[PDB]
Amino acid sequence: DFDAIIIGAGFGGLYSLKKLRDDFNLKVRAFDRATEVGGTWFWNQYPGALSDSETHLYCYSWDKELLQEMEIKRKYISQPDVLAYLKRVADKHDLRKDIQFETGIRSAYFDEENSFWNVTTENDEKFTARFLITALGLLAAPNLPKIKGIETFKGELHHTSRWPKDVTFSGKRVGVIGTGSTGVQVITAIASQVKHLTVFQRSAQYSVPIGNVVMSETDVAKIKENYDQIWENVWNSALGYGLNESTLPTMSVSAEERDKIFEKAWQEGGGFRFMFETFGDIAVDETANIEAQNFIKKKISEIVKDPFVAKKLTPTDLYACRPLCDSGYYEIFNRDNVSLEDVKANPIVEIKEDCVVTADGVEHKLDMLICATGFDAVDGNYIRMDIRGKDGISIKDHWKDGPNSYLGMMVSNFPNMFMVFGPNGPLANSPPIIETQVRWIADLIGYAEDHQINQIEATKDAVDNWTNTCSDIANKTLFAVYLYMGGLKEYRNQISEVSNNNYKGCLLKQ
């Protein structure tokens, strides 16, 4: 028996454990398949792995001593450092004693008679708890790509999601499949280290510089001395990325001024910065979206000296969502040991013992093939497990037509279960979202313990009304199963209205 069981020991699960155990004095256990804390920052050890938000914001804000104590080494934070930070959090707040590592949860069945969750590990261990905190998503299990004969490759075959240790690159011909955010990081990191790099791009995307530089002692002090305000700005923003979020229309200024504004964001770096600090309507106005793209296309044509290679790199879609971020990606393609294959025009048809073969019949001889096809679904990690709520219905079935929730945290027919960083949540920097949700969920659970209620469930009406809110907002924009896209501040307003009005939309049963 526990008051709560938590699944996941990443950002989400760790803070859930801290809040529920230490601030609400609940008896709680957390579980993870991993051998240590860190979540996706434990699993993803691929070359070039790097946060998308700046170091000083990609962290917890609730421990002020930790803010002052923590190293701010570079403007953005590498995977090994995020892992060390989360391990430090675990150290300081004595969290590991309440985490069971190497423990996959196979199933969670809700008991309506006793108003609690039956949780079964993959080693057939059974636990009971009133509440189930799911801090799971969304890192997809290493699915090898569906390519004929992939199993016959005798060289190294690595998936970015399970990057083994001790990989060396020198003297080797290497191929990478995928040019999403993960592929860009790996490609940029390894190109100078391999004998030859072949990039298999199915779909080109725009990338802007991340502009990751070392932070001076003076840079760090500016942040640490003003940390309270820096966080107040996060809570009062849409993205929580530390940006001066623009309301200026792209076409309201001259062509010369517009170039100047894009150029300033380009020099500073950051994907959301280029899209949201420059102007206020890039994700909304077609003309404005095209202007932004043309700025990046022009950069591609300038950096990549071979116009034919520049062309292949240039996305062909009419409108573009957020760009990726890089630390020298387009530069790579000027190298004599790098080949770009457009495998939309010239697809992979087979993989043989020593090569990737494209539809033109060319045998791309490889010593190593890397799958950076980090391809998933937002509710993938919920669907993967056997979760059953009311009348025994599975989450797989309830979401067969797609993930729907109330406030991104509650699923109708699944009482006493609360999602952290689940589907239909806000579009923003993750750790502020996760803090926002963990604190809301805990206050609700605390409310329940204080009013002697043992069953909390979102009504179908609240769920569909959340679906509606998301839809009305989302369809204002060009892009694009909806996130809530009103921003962090408004998401915080939405959930506050719920908690401030007796948790309307929630069935509270004594």
- Hey, which residues between 380 and 399 contact ligand FAD (CB under 6 A)? 381, 385
Tokens of 258: 């517009």
Stretch that binds ligand FAD, among 26-34, 259-267, 352-360, 397-405 (CB under 6 A): 26-34
C-beta of 360: minimal distance to ligand FAD in Å? Answer: 33
For residue 188, the SS3 value is helix
C-beta of 52: minimal distance to ligand FAD in Å? Answer: 3
Q: Is 135 in the site for ligand FAD (CB under 6 A)?
A: yes
Q: Is 189 in the site for ligand FAD (CB under 6 A)?
A: no
Q: Is 104 in the site for ligand FAD (CB under 6 A)?
A: yes
**Beta strand residue intervals within 40-178, DSSP E:** 50-54, 76-78, 99-100, 105-111, 116-121, 126-134, 156-159, 173-177
Question: What is d(CA 356, CA 365) in angstroms, rounded to the nearest whole number?
Answer: 7
Which of 2, 3, 6, 8 touches ligand FAD by CB under 6 A? 8
Name the one residue in this structure whose structure tokens are 């043989």.
352
Q: Is 342 in the site for ligand FAD (CB under 6 A)?
A: no
Q: Is the link from the previous residue into 67 a cis peptide, with omega within 30 of 0?
A: no
Nearer to ligand FAD, 253 or 377 (CB): 377
User: What is the 8-class DSSP label of residue 462?
Assistant: H
Three-state secondary structure along 204-264? CCCEEECCCCECCHHHHHHHHHCHHHHHHHHHCCCCCCCCCCCCCCHHHCCHHHHHHHHHH
- Hey, which residues between 399 and 438 contact ligand FAD (CB under 6 A)? 420-421, 429-430, 434
**Beta strand residue intervals within 294-336, DSSP E:** 324-326
Which of 3, 5, 10, 388 touches ligand FAD by CB under 6 A? 10
Total residue count of the chain as it appears in this document: 510
Q: Please identify the residue of the shown chain whose CB is closest to the bound ligand FAD.
A: 39
Question: What is d(CA 393, CA 413) in angstroms, rounded to the nearest whole number?
Answer: 8
Tokens of 112: 């309506």
Element (DSSP H or E) covering residue 134: strand 126-134
Which of 22, 24, 33, 248 touches ligand FAD by CB under 6 A? 33
Q: Is the dihedral of CA 187, 192, 197, 201 positive or negative?
A: positive
Nearer to ligand FAD, 36 or 350 (CB): 36
Is there a contact between 331 and 348 (Cβ–Cβ < 8 Å)? no
Nearer to ligand FAD, 84 or 349 (CB): 84
Nearer to ligand FAD, 210 or 355 (CB): 210
Q: Is 32 in the site for ligand FAD (CB under 6 A)?
A: yes
Q: Is 188 in the site for ligand FAD (CB under 6 A)?
A: no
Q: Which residues contact 388 (CB under 8 A, 6 or more apart)?
A: 107, 108, 109, 110, 394, 395
- Hey, which residues between 38 and 77 contact ligand FAD (CB under 6 A)? 39-40, 44, 49, 51-53, 58
Task: With CA atoms as reference, report the closest residue to 185 among 326, 322, 354.
Answer: 326
Nearer to ligand FAD, 112 or 125 (CB): 125
Nearer to ligand FAD, 136 or 189 (CB): 136
Tokens of 72: 């701010």
C-beta of 465: minimal distance to ligand FAD in Å? Answer: 25
C-beta of 9: minimal distance to ligand FAD in Å? Answer: 6
Given the rule CB under 6 A, which residues bind ligand FAD? Answer: 7-13, 31-34, 39-40, 44, 49, 51-53, 58, 104-105, 135-136, 139, 381, 385, 420-421, 429-430, 434
